[PDB]
């Protein structure tokens, strides 16, 4: 018996709503943090935003063609025309995508825009019975889908190791020394929720969009995998998580494979 | 009246914006990038710190009088269908603040309408006397937001090198800065709306994301009912024509004009 404990966390902020429920214990719907469904600041961000500085593509169709500045940059355009990944897409080293922008001569529903257009997929904040919280979908989703945004604060490294509560960050590893992560603690979307698995149906992927700033990538989760609806959504930590993490608890995953427990 | 183009935003607005020359042969304008929302070139540091945001925790659809964000504007001067209330005072704006993603309310309460974007069908045409102009292809009720004046966002100084001048929006308040909106290089279609000394159109200064007083969004909202077919204008204010004046003088047609 699932009680429905809110019509959608996001408030209306996604394209469609994101319900949450209870079925396990007592909890409420969470509510000790802020929802943005886009990444937002604290300390000043130096996010270069010049627009003379965006490369872009002087495209005259809808940019499936290899001349395309876009794909080009993207080493060639990953998406199909469904907005889903090509096959070929290597998922265990996914290189960096860059889906044209404001600056480009093509229209708004070019082939090479998925992310920006935001989540299209029915997701439901639930309540699991070991992890806690965690976010499943209520439909099925094809392999290669965009699903959702890694949205949270976006703080420096050094910032990173004043914060307590870490179990929310995302980083953004440069061999620049310029290193960034998103904490999701204080401000975040659903992608917060989504609990590690270390055979995940969900793979994040570096995207550039409205700037190129390449110290700053959004994070997209697509699946790895066909999701059939009900199935919890889930995606692998990392080895700087778990190896900090590790030293508290087990992985509660319970993949064959697991590889933290 | 041949067609120029079927959407000059290129699918960036809520609704496209035609474009028809009825007039001379001039192909739809291109000397320019075509922008939905504000831009800027050099930096311009605008302080985006979320914690610094004023915000409501209405528990309604801010409709209200205890809405902060209201509040802040003196009161929500929005209606139920997201117009101007009747005691707004069109020769005397006041600074509108509408929620923002700060506030607990919901993403369609009544305070949010310049931020929902272009809802009015527009059309871009060849005018005999003023080069370009904005049309309205359908009537549109008093107090209602038409758009917004969006384009490159630079310093006072900035503009003060910049020979071309004539796509200028003042953004002021001195006390050591004072920014523009220039719309020459990068602009929407308001870069295209002609100066009319009894306008249809009244520009308002509205914050929304950000909170940030030295960058105000101009958004411009009818005077008065405007029926279809009917140009759209707006005060192109004092700077404009001093400057200006001394090459042409106004060709609004208005009985009451004040630059010609
Ligand atoms: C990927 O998931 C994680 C990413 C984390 N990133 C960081 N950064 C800050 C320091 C390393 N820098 C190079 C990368 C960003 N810190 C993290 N944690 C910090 C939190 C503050 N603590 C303070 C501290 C230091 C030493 C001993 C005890 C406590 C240091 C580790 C993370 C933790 C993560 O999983 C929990
Ligand atoms: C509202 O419409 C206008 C606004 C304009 N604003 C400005 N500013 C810069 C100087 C005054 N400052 C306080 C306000 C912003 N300059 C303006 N014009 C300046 C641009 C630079 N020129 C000098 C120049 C000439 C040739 C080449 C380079 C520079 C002097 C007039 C404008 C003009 C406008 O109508 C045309
Ligand atoms: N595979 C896994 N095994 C055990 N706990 C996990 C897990 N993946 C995520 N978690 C748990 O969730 C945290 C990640 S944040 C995800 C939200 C969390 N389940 C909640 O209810 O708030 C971790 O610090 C850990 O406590
Ligand atoms: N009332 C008016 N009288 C004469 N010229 C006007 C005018 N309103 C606008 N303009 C003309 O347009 C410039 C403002 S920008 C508006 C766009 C312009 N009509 C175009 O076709 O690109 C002015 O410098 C002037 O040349
Ligand atoms: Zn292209
Ligand atoms: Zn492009
Ligand atoms: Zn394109
Ligand atoms: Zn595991
Ligand atoms: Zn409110
Ligand atoms: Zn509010
Ligand atoms: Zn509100
Ligand atoms: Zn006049």
Request: hydrophobic share 30%; glycine share 6%; proline share 5%.
């Amino acid at each position: 018996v699932e009680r429905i404990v809110s019509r959608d966390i996001a408030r209306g902020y996604e394209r469609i709503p994101i319900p949450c429920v209870n079925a396990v214990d007592s909890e409420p719907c969470p509510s000790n943090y802020k929802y943005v469904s886009q990444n937002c600041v604290t300390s000043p961000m130096n996010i270069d935003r010049n627009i003379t500085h965006l490369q872009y593509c002087v495209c005259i169709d809808d940019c499936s063609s290899s001349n395309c500045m876009c794909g080009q940059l993207s080493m060639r355009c990953w998406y199909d025309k469904d907005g889903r990944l090509l096959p070929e897409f290597n998922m265990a080293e996914p290189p960096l995508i860059f889906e044209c922008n404001h600056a480009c001569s093509c229209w708004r529903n070019c082939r090479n825009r998925v992310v920006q257009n935001g989540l299209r997929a029915r997701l439901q904040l639930y309540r699991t019975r070991d992890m806690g919280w965690g976010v499943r979908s209520l439909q099925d989703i094809p392999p290669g889908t965009f699903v959702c945004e890694y949205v949270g604060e976006l703080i420096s490294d050094s910032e990173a190791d004043v914060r307590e509560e870490d179990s929310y960050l995302f980083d953004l590893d440069n061999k620049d020394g310029e290193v960034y992560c998103i904490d999701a603690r204080f401000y975040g979307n659903v992608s917060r929720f989504i609990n590690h698995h270390c055979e995940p149906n969900l793979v994040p992927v570096r995207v550039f969009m409205a700037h190129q700033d390449l110290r700053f990538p959004r994070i997209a989760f697509f699946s790895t995998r066909l999701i059939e609806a009900g199935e919890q959504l889930g995606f692998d930590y990392g080895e700087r998580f778990w190896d900090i993490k590790g030293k508290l608890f087990s992985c509660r995953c319970g993949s064959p494979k697991c590889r933290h427990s």
